[PDB]
């Protein structure tokens, strides 16, 4: 088998920016990788398509995945509202790391963040499950619309998404 690859087509105020592809580490965190994969295809009847990155802090990360409230308070996994921290084998080693947002131990839903720098203080607390495969330049472009407090100056949305391989 091979690790699945998913893509997001990002738009800024409705204008297409570009595509970012991610490799999901199903071989190390199969349950977490599967949750993200299924939310990207929308196969369970809900998902990331049309949602926004509600919090972007330059030099830190881009956060998104709240497809229900769109403000950081919502979203849900494909296993129910929340699921356990699978493992902490992988670390936040640098730009491009894909990791799960949470509200403490065992509270994974649908929210995630893409790191734009090494964030070692999150190691052991947030489950790393993938990495940017192509399109890191689109992620860098995304940062331009963020701020120190996280509010974006333009609406950044996932116009389309799905599985490539």
């Amino acid at each position: 088998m091979v690790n699945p690859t998913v893509f997001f087509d990002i738009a800024v105020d409705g204008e297409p920016l570009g595509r970012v592809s991610f490799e999901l580490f199903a071989d190390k965190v199969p349950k977490t990788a599967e949750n993200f994969r299924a939310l990207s295809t929308g196969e369970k009847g809900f998902g990331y398509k049309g949602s926004c990155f509600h919090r972007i802090i330059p030099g830190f990360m881009c956060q998104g995945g709240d497809f229900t409230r769109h403000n950081g308070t919502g979203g849900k996994s494909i296993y129910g509202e929340k699921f356990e921290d699978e493992n902490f084998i992988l670390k936040h080693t640098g730009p491009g790391i894909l990791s799960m947002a949470n509200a403490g131990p065992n509270t994974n839903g649908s929210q995630f963040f893409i790191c734009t720098a090494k964030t070692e203080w999150l190691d052991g607390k947030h489950v790393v499950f993938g990495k940017v495969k192509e399109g890191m330049n689109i992620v860098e472009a995304m940062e331009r619309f963020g701020s120190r407090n996280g509010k974006t100056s333009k609406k950044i949305t996932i116009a389309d998404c799905g599985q490539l391989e």
Binding site: I57, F60, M61, G72, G74, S99, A101, N102, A103, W121
Partner: peptide, 11 residues
Amino acid sequence: XLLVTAGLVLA
């Protein structure tokens, strides 16, 4: 600080 939470964003 620099955390990534869902609901109560901390310092």
